[PDB]
Design an enzyme around this catalytic site. Structure first.
Site, PDB file in Angstrom:
ATOM      1  N   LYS A  62       0.811  -1.210   0.000  1.00 33.70           N
ATOM      2  CA  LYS A  62       0.000   0.000   0.000  1.00 33.70           C
ATOM      3  C   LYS A  62       0.848   1.264   0.000  1.00 33.70           C
ATOM      4  O   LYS A  62       0.445   2.271  -0.594  1.00 33.70           O
ATOM      5  CB  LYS A  62      -0.933   0.016   1.214  1.00 33.70           C
ATOM      6  CG  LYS A  62      -1.925   1.170   1.207  1.00 33.70           C
ATOM      7  CD  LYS A  62      -2.848   1.142   2.418  1.00 33.70           C
ATOM      8  CE  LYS A  62      -3.836  -0.014   2.358  1.00 33.70           C
ATOM      9  NZ  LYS A  62      -4.864   0.094   3.433  1.00 33.70           N
ATOM     10  N   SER A 113       4.305   1.310  -1.013  1.00 30.19           N
ATOM     11  CA  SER A 113       5.555   0.747  -1.501  1.00 30.19           C
ATOM     12  C   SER A 113       5.516   0.566  -3.014  1.00 30.19           C
ATOM     13  O   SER A 113       4.477   0.724  -3.656  1.00 30.19           O
ATOM     14  CB  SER A 113       5.838  -0.599  -0.823  1.00 30.19           C
ATOM     15  OG  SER A 113       5.456  -0.580   0.543  1.00 30.19           O
ATOM     16  N   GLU A 114       6.692   0.261  -3.573  1.00 32.33           N
ATOM     17  CA  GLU A 114       6.849  -0.211  -4.953  1.00 32.33           C
ATOM     18  C   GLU A 114       8.247  -0.821  -5.006  1.00 32.33           C
ATOM     19  O   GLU A 114       9.237  -0.089  -4.918  1.00 32.33           O
ATOM     20  CB  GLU A 114       6.698   0.927  -5.964  1.00 32.33           C
ATOM     21  CG  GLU A 114       5.254   1.180  -6.417  1.00 32.33           C
ATOM     22  CD  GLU A 114       5.028   0.970  -7.912  1.00 32.33           C
ATOM     23  OE1 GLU A 114       5.953   0.514  -8.618  1.00 32.33           O
ATOM     24  OE2 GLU A 114       3.910   1.266  -8.386  1.00 32.33           O
ATOM     25  N   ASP A 142       2.220  -7.434  11.582  1.00 33.62           N
ATOM     26  CA  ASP A 142       1.805  -7.880  10.256  1.00 33.62           C
ATOM     27  C   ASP A 142       2.539  -9.161   9.877  1.00 33.62           C
ATOM     28  O   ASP A 142       2.973  -9.331   8.731  1.00 33.62           O
ATOM     29  CB  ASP A 142       2.017  -6.790   9.201  1.00 33.62           C
ATOM     30  CG  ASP A 142       1.165  -6.998   7.961  1.00 33.62           C
ATOM     31  OD1 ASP A 142       0.240  -7.841   7.986  1.00 33.62           O
ATOM     32  OD2 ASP A 142       1.423  -6.312   6.948  1.00 33.62           O
TER      33      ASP A 142
HETATM   34 MG   LIG Z   1       3.720  -6.769   3.175  1.00 32.82          MG
END
Ligand SMILES: [Mg+2]
Ligand SMILES: Nc1nc2c(ncn2[C@@H]2O[C@H](COP(=O)(O)OP(=O)(O)NP(=O)(O)O)[C@@H](O)[C@H]2O)c(=O)[nH]1
Ligand SMILES: [Mg+2]
Ligand SMILES: [Mg+2]
Lengths: 323, 327
Positions: B44, B46-47, B151
């Site tokens: 979300k 990031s790239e 996470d």
């Molecule tokens: Mg992740």
């Protein structure tokens, strides 16, 4: 392999309907005949109420069965029916369902139990002999009826101390003994599990109950309750070995060709066998006798086939004052 | 109230600048030192690209942080810096930007990951034991550094199955643990959310990550992946209750004074606690052991305070084959 030294063949000598519990068909009555007055206790499988049968005003106990497979209910019901009238075995009175929820429930005779934590601290030597003898009558009976209880522990032994009355209850883990049959080792409460269960030996028998009964005897005479207080199923074996000894454990494993999980070799260590007299001190000396220690030593043995049977235990000099 | 059973006070014993990520001041270099060989994925914020650092030929991963609130950038950077050198934690190599666009990005050590979908279909009993132990090392480490990951899930665990390498990645949701602090329950991914999150209990701790790790263990040994497959956050709790039991859930809610959303009354039903052996069949028997189920039972518990800590889990007999070979 291994076989019971007593009552090994009794189930094969009976009609198949006796032990083929999957074929048993309970008749489920209406639980609205029962008024639930007081929560008497609870377990891993039920909530238990003092109740009154509204048609005859008889006081009873209603165990509402938490959800579970029908095969397990059939087993508990058939076992109770087979043992009805046995000495000191709780009497099953009825099998009922709530008419709305349909939840099944077992109706038993009522016993006015004294909680063991409070009761055990006022027992005398004579009282311990008396109640252990009464419990042995129940175990010899069920064993002679081809049934292992598999959950012997203080919470499953009801005692009315004022009327000197004992009932072995909670037959939900009980199972029919058939020679050579391999059983689930995930039975009994941790502190009362025999070494056979902790080393994953499945070909066990009625002698499993005698281990549990020796655990109870030890806690009653020594006042260390539970006597073997494992932190988990692995430390439970360690607690036993620190008393019975590690060389004696290896001898038992060797005799039955049991492979011990390698992780055990570190936590087990090396421990001599302890004299049972080592557990006597000022707070328990008036409950311990040479005769009690002799009996205890003959029940708490690794080798299930060498432990005393219920009837052999009943004939022990420890019980001469109560015979 | 509620407190972590371990590492509760650690952050208060450190310098304020350790946990006061708001005041952290990164040093942003030039991303032109990194050539972008292949886009590996994207989150979300990031790239992500497999890359090479031109100044030393080392292969790395370039995660371009999408524009978020600056506070959340500092949190991830500060947490990654505190965990540098930690066992099996992904190594932050640098924090870089473009001269005129100002877009921030993180540089990480490269891991030749096998996607868990292929990998989990060819792990052996020992392999699962091995990789779960390496992940426990990362979790114990970060917890000991006062940090919750929040996470944990297969997608954020990179495993090089050839060189037997594991890295816990994606720290954008991680937070610092301070006792009594109430935290957002909108963390983790649905299938790995602990019951505390699903019932809005905000005073959670590191034990949240242990729920997530038990979810991974369960899916690896049973091959039901995800193990708890909710269609939304409500059904997620129902899936859990079908295994751990509803009377066990109400006892937990009663202990922490938790009152349920009224929608749950219609969907939860009544379920007994299931024995973990019920999930064994012919397709997973070769991965299940009594020791695996003992450990799983002690991780997947409603009461966060009762779950094993990372260090406790590391002592479990399930990992005995792993502890001895590493010696
Ligand atoms: Mg992740
Ligand atoms: N006063 C009294 N209490 C009883 C009686 N029967 C059962 N109880 C109480 O209710 C408890 C649970 O009964 P039980 O048959 O063991 O149910 P369970 O779910 O199988 N328990 P477990 O977890 O051991 O398997 C008992 O431990 C006891 O305290 C009784 O006849 N009189
Ligand atoms: Mg009971
Ligand atoms: Mg029972």
């Amino acid at each position: 392999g291994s076989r019971a030294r007593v009552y090994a063949e009794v189930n094969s000598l009976r009609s198949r309907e006796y032990w083929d519990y999957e074929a048993h068909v309970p008749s489920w009555g209406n639980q609205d005949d029962y008024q639930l007055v007081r929560k008497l206790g609870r377990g891993k499988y039920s909530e238990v109420f003092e109740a009154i049968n509204i048609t005859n005003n008889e006081r009873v106990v209603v165990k509402i069965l938490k959800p579970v497979k029908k095969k397990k209910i059939k087993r508990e019901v058939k076992i109770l029916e087979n043992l009805r009238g046995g000495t000191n075995i709780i009497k099953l009175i009825d099998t009922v369902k709530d008419p709305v929820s349909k939840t099944p429930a077992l109706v038993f005779e009522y016993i006015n139990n004294t909680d063991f934590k409070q009761l055990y601290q006022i027992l005398t030597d004579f009282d311990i002999r008396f109640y252990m003898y009464e419990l042995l009558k129940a175990l010899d009976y069920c064993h002679s009826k081809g049934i292992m209880h598999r959950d012997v522990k203080p919470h499953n032994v009801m005692i009315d101390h004022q009327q000197k009355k004992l009932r072995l209850i909670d037959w939900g883990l009980a199972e029919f003994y058939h020679p050579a049959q391999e059983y689930n080792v995930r039975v009994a409460s941790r502190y009362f599990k025999g070494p056979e269960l902790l080393v994953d030996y499945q070909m066990y028998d009625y002698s499993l109950d005698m281990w549990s009964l020796g655990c109870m005897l030890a806690s009653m005479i020594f006042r260390r309750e539970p006597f073997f207080h494992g932190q988990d199923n692995y430390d439970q074996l360690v607690r036993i070995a620190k008393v019975l000894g590690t060389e004696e454990l290896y001898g038992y494993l060797k005799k039955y060709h049991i492979d011990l999980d390698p992780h055990f070799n570190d936590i087990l260590g090396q421990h001599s066998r302890k004299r049972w007299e080592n557990f006597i001190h000022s707070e328990n000396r008036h409950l311990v006798s040479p005769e009690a220690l002799d009996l205890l030593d003959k029940l708490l043995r690794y080798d299930h086939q060498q432990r005393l049977t219920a009837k052999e235990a009943m004939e022990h000099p420890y019980f001469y004052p109560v015979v």
